[model samples]
Target: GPNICTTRGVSSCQQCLAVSPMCAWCSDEALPLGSPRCDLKENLLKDNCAPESIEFPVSEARVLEDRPLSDKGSGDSSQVTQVSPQRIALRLRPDDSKNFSIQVRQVEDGNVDLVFLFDGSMSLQPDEFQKILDFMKDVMKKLSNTSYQFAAVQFSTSYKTEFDFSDYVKWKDPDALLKHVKHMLLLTNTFGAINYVATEVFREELGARPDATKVLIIITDGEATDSGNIDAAKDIIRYIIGIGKHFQTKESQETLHKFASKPASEFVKILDTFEKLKDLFTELQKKIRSKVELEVRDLPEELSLSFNATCLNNEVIPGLKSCMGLKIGDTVSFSIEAKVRGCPQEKEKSFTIKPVGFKDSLIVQVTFDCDCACQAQAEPNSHRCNNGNGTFECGVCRCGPGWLGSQCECSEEQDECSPREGQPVCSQRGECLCGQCVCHSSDFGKITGKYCECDDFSCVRYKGEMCSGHGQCSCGDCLCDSDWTGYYCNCTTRTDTCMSSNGLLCSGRGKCECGSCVCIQPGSYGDTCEKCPTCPDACTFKKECVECKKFDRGALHDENTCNRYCRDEIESVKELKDTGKDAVNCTYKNEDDCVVRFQYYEDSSGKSILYVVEEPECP
Candidate 1:
């Protein structure tokens, strides 16, 4: 069973018809109450439903109107029609295809090349020979309305030509047929003559038009001395007229039949004598009329139409619209098989078919019978349908635009979950269902937010660690742990690691930043910014400051100047004592010629302590 016809959504006749072409709807009242009304036609019939109660429409194909192809030198000169059935109509249904025949014929406006290949032996009298010449003239006269060219060839033990198509062009007279036939040849090598005419007589160098329709009439009395090879293009139309009683035998008739075109009965004629060819003229004239080659244009696409064709030679080709090697006065019927792939809303469409080149075209009007009569059979504004927001039809509710669900109670528009205008509903990472957001699952972590805007895995990482292993990633940012801070929680708030043993952070020469000290003074290098090998020694740098503060007798002896210049606190003492191993002892001479001694040291609290000799030793 095809589930399409039995799908849960197939609640109405229109819904069933939209699924498959084989499905039908039944409205029989006597059917069982709970039995399905929409199903495959055969299934419904077996369920005891009457045939008349079933609604099934079949695809139709018919030729609505047809105009005959244009004849030679007739019809309106504005356009030439070559393909028949100029208009047609197709009532189509999906999955159900139909085929129709289109006939294409060649117009009679092309040029003609008639070559007379005759058996010129010493056996015939002059009267019989004259009859042959008169026969040639009569054939030319009947076809005078055509743009005609004639060539004459004679064969005996060898091949010879009196004149080619150019001579007919120059003289354009029936008497030229007599003038071109010169006497003196013998023996009938009929097959050899056919081969000679195919190769030599019908050549463009001898004034044969390449586009002309070629017709070869071979008049011979007997079979060939040699079986000649006749390898000619199939487009050439060959006819044979056996001119004596000897051809009545099977051997001679078969020989002639082998050289003529296929369906040898039509192209090969046997007569007891040459005179009756006049009687065969009517049929020969019809065969000699035209050559048909076809070109099709504007055929619908193969995918849309599901098109394929059997062309002029009964050659089945898939989607090949053109054909070749067609005979004149013969209807080359092309079997065009097609069906549309889709059904339009209005159930009808039109397309044009063309061939015989650009102008002449056929119009194909298609009516898609893929609709059901129960489509609009519904109760409008029914209370059972979304509180009267939809129509109740065939046991289901037909919801309005921007609405869906069994009762049409749910909104289909994205506005339900779009809290901010112009933003994607549920941040494009979740689904909007019944006006609520359902976030999508992700491999990295949980995406949790009203609009799926928060995810733990999306936070920045430092040195291959999320939040630098010092914080928690929440709401796309790092919540740093104690004493750690920064966008990635990689920065430290404590500067104790950057302090020097001299009791000043970075020895007061650099700033503490990110738990490290970067010295700013020139030539300063080392951890904690404490090593500056290129600067003055500490004892020499502090000598003037110690003198100004402790003795008050240096260049900065004024109270305001001493306070500003001497920042180190110098303790006045009776003796210089050792403070620690890291302390430096220095000596300085004052203006009074007294030697002053002191010990300079920095403690763990970042304070500089100086112990100076209270009484300087005189020199």
Candidate 2:
């Protein structure tokens, strides 16, 4: 039996002999305690009204009844009766049974092994060369960790291991890494190097670290010179897939389950067709580390129109739950709000999402409703959504009647806009399409876009409009058929002021770009083209005038020649003084008679001559 308690205005006491202070009933005789107090809230039974014993079968109860009583006994009857594995008692009591939340975190230390396969080819100029180095430095910073191991391989023509596993460096000591990177010499042959890495380096050296999270980061300009050996590229892909499969196998063995299992050959097959992929590295990284989660809940209020926003891959509306375990190429579609306050209002926006990476993450965009107004009976062009104004809804635009494309950016008869018949479209470097030329060259190297206006090989280099910007270049010569006349075939002013110079101002050895001479003389050949001849004898003899005259007559030949020739010869001789060759060669033919001579001499025509003038017999 259970009793209930009632509250009074201030206080009320139960007047009864059966009621006690400790108990729900008192011991006072005035009241018999309406019923034996029992707290139904705590599910606690009190007094003799509660059940006193539990029943059991004879056979099952026999073990409990026959147990020994002493603590030292093998088994105790009371203990056996109190505890029974078969009989479970579920007691309910008044308690705060709210669910308790516990945050569980798992931290794991792993080694990320990175291999940088850099392209060091002649195709990369100095600026690009520096850019490659900068990119390496940035990657090193990005993957910096004490446990991170890095190896570098440079490729051009052939692949060579710049750094190996044995050369593992601490990321904290980045200077050492940078030092090694700086020393990495750029190679001239890129195709040969890629082939070498695929065939030799990866197959042999990289295979040894099969257990590591091996990542091969290849940075190239998308030009494979080794395109001939497409099979080799396939083999390389197979090798990578093999490593990934090994990872999968190892992971499965450790986790003791098979959730997402695929053979190595399967991944290799996927990699074989990497060219069709927009980003290969992004896909590969997803395979190595991926997360899959499934969640289901009601859609948020704002996006309830569609009620179901699914993450086809891993994309969901900001607050929606996603369906997990999506594969590549899987398209996920869901409903979206047609309109918002500041945006256009429509029925529903359907989105197609694609899964990427191992985790199957996806990016999606909503397709809004059509804004075309004429729904019933209007002309084909007149039915388009105009939104009353010039603009249309659902990514469509309206421009009177002559517009096309999603944004109405195109006009009717666009073909007529084509360049007027060979009218210098793309400067002849590209094809004219819709009034514009799409250059065949790339932003890289010398090719540029639209009329090839921005190219490394432009008229600026040749100096002109048209090339000189005004004339055409024909057979390595500018046919300055207009107002220009120069080596680059440009134009000149008709005014006499423009023809100020006769012979290039400085004999074609200097610049006359703006009717000004910027002289650039040949080395050792200046304005006068005067070059001093080398003296036959030592120039130190010139410092002493008396010795200089005697030396000149014997070796230099004249006072003027000495002035010009000896001055330059003196400078050269001073430079070679330590060698002692010239000084020793300049000794007097007869030292006793003080008659000097030179080892060699040069006449005015700059020809070497040997004059052996004998001294008069001291008459």
Candidate 3:
């Protein structure tokens, strides 16, 4: 036929390897009986070969790779497949006012005692005084039933009390205190007023109630004018300030020590100022600015960093550079030096170098350190290297075990150790640390563990240690077991029960809990809950019992039960007028010598109400 060959472009297939160079394309020996010999061509056109039916049996077909097919046409296939932008979304910024409102709600729910102090000084004209009174009324109305108390004091040459904070009225009352202010005459001495408040009012009256919120509001035209020892007044302020400082410092030190033992972030929030510093600053600025011509300079439009300096001339100097135009997020180093002139040569005060303007500005006070020393110094820096200042040091920046880097900023990574791994982790109360566990003590009788998961049973009596070890022991410690509860575990719970054995529990009109009885039935009170009484017949004829009680028992009616009841009723009314509640468990033995004892419970509006009734006998 034709030169039939599997290979293309090969002239002869049978040739000796030594003689023919084309023989290299053939196998070492000719094809075996079943094997086929074929020559493959290089760079040959497939169209040159004739079409032929050929069947070759192979093991299997292999697919080298597979990928998702694109829907776009083949020309420009590089573009990626894209759908609508449905996954992403835009959110508007949150409203700061709304956030503030939520924060206010949280504060309202907390048990905080708020005390408002009003200033009545001569600097304020009669109209201004009236305006202050109006403000007080509005505040009272707004905070009605809230955990707050309102008080007023007017300072002229001396402090003359318009009303003590002890005097409370219903928020719904028609501004009774305001009406009283309108009728009262103004005094001329302002400094005397401040002195009066510091000495008599604060020390003698409110000092006993230390836990309560103590605020002094002084509404004055300007600085104090009364000729008094200004130094003495300042000393009083310092003393009061010391009280808060001491408490806060003690609390912080205890917390810090506790945190050191366990290394936790739980106590950081409690270290902030007692009163919100920002709020206090804002209120103070408002009052001061309203009274003087405020001049602001170098103040940032954002108001992130601002300072106000009130000169002795009653001028409000504002917009002062806070260490030099410091922005909200900017960090800067600052230094301050203060020196007094024309002072005794012996007195000179100097402070060591310290950092300022980190998170907050350093409040450098330049007051005369003493009669001789009148200098102070402040400095800021990044590194903790000390420059010999006794108060400033970088002792905490030393590198040691578990620490790295020049500033000791890096921490060594530790593998988490579980309790099952033979590690006594977290004292079983907290998590494991580097194959170890730290324990925590109970606070307020509650045992808080690593996850804050602990039974509150310990908080029931004397917090952690029952009765502070004074009485018999119980759950956590000594509990008198029989009839006692409290830090000392000495209070008898059965005393009320014993007294009530006969009609004493609520005077036979109330229910008893842990020995003390609560009035369940109305119109009855006292240890025995025995007594049937009524206001004096003629007293009932008066507008208020306060006026009716002015008359003596004999002068009124001379009826023993009636007189006793009316007198007790009158006294109760007076107590209500003065202190907003009658003393509890009031009893009338006769008309003149009735005894009143009370315990106050705060109502929903935060107002204390005394559940009182007349009794025939004393406990």
Candidate 4:
């Protein structure tokens, strides 16, 4: 019931028994899964490794380190840095070991140098060759010539260089390419052509950047007649298609396979017709990615390691995988795989190796390079305004005075008599002259301005009001319209305003101006000479009475109640002293008409007091 050993705390005997095949684990003891008791068997049992009837020695695994038994310098390794079982676990039967490797990689968009290697021997006659040329033209249209370069090489008994990757020199003139290829010596020696391209053309001198993706496509109806090496082939992703039933022979097929890239099954294609090429190219485009690697050829004896990389958001990079004895004097190669999420949507999408430990020097960059196309979607709406000084709209032009446009473009300042908007200029308000309206400005008992359009009934007052209630303002003048019309609508046609209410209109007192009757009589004034000296002077009619009377309210007056005023004055008193200070003097009431009324009342102090009211007004 034992299982694989991992870092999770294992206290079970079954987990303890789980051992790697190369690890010599003890089945003799009952140890928990996460036991520090690993070497306890050798220490506790002197006779523990004994086999029943045998005396041969059993091999053992000892965890090792090239350095000291102690960890010196420090930095924690990533816990999830890929649980590499092969690198972390080591077993010994005493003599066997494997190489532990680590590599760094990157994802990026870069330039590409794609070359088409054609096998134009006799088998591919001019007619069939025409189809290949058509295919090349179609493929050329799909690529961005500025960013991606292409070259074509034709192979017969030997290799003939058609064109190098540069301006559309040969590709632009396909007819010329046709003329040239049709006259070539026709005998297939595909290897010689491939070897030459692999050896010579794909270099900086040929306009190929070392960092570019180099691709070689070999199209042949027959297999290679010569066998040799494809010199620069290691850096290129090659596709060899064996076309026709002509190349179905075993030897022909093997020759086709020999020139293919790694995983021959994936890179080699044998097609019966040229029509199947669309599928071949489509699939090839999908797999057109570059390989990246990191070399950690040296390691500490404990073999502690970690790996990190940045991948496209839609893609994930794998963990660190290594084993021994990959050290200072040896070499181990690693290829890291990166994939695009959606290969069709082109977008430029970087990663580097970080030593991130006590030793900070072993870092390198594994860059992801790509760039997307984005500029054609760049203006906003306000741009239509043009930021010009024009004052108007409706697809404009310069303004002229009287003939002025809003943008100050044209001026018709003196053009007075032109038709505008199907109506006479001046907006039909007044006569337009010199680009300005001579609005009506006179009074004909009604209205007038520069132009004869203002009525007497509009601008100038009818009765000292803006057109009053009888008329309105038009062209800055009042046009009287209430039908009491003399002029400006203020007077009647019958002269009733100038005459009185059967009394000569002003009560024979004065004249009438605009319906208001002015009277010559000092007391006459109103719509018809009616109100003046309306009431007697309030202070002049004061009354002196014999008795005092009270009104219904406070000091404020309501004329309906007690409306007049009364008064007090100094008068001659003829010996009317009834009580004198400390004197017994008495006198009778005055004979004149003067009287008083008396009343008795008690104050808060309980004293009786007498007060008299008087008619009290004299002189």
- Best candidate (score: lDDT): 1
Name the regions of candidate 1 deviating beyond 4 angstroms.
Answer: 2-68, 72-102, 106-110, 287-332, 336-619
lDDT by residue (1-619, candidate 1, tens digit) is 5444654235456656655677787866578865677788888877898876677778877898787765665433644456788888887764456777676666666466888887777766787777777887888777765666888888877888877888788876777646757655577776677778878888999899865657788777667677656765344667777778777664668777677764454567667787776666766665444233333344443213322344445645433344433455444555565545445556456776654312345677777777665445667887877778777665556776666665778885435566677898878988886555667999988775657666777789999999887666665877664446799988875555665544355767887777688898765556765544344576775687786666546665532234333445577889977675646788878788788888776655755567888888997
On the 0 to 100 scale, the lDDT of residue 299 in model 2 is 20
Q: Give the TM-scores of the predictions, in the order they appear.
A: 0.37, 0.22, 0.22, 0.33
Candidate 4 lDDT tens digits, 92-165: 12112222223222112234577888878777766667666666666666663333577788888878667777
Per-candidate Cα lDDT values, in order, are 0.66, 0.33, 0.30, 0.41
RMSD of 2: 37.6
Model 3 lDDT at residue 324: 17
Question: After superposing candidate 2, which stretches have Cα over 4 Å from the reference?
Answer: 1-109, 170-175, 178-192, 202-208, 229-619
What TM-score does prediction 3 earn? 0.22
Q: Residue 25 in model 2: shift from native, Å?
A: 73
Residue 158 of candidate 3: its Cα lDDT?
48
Cα lDDT over the full model 2:
0.33
| Ranking of all candidate structures by their lDDT, best first | 1, 4, 2, 3
The parts of candidate 3 lying over 4 Å away from their true place are: 1-126, 169-174, 182-188, 203-208, 229-619
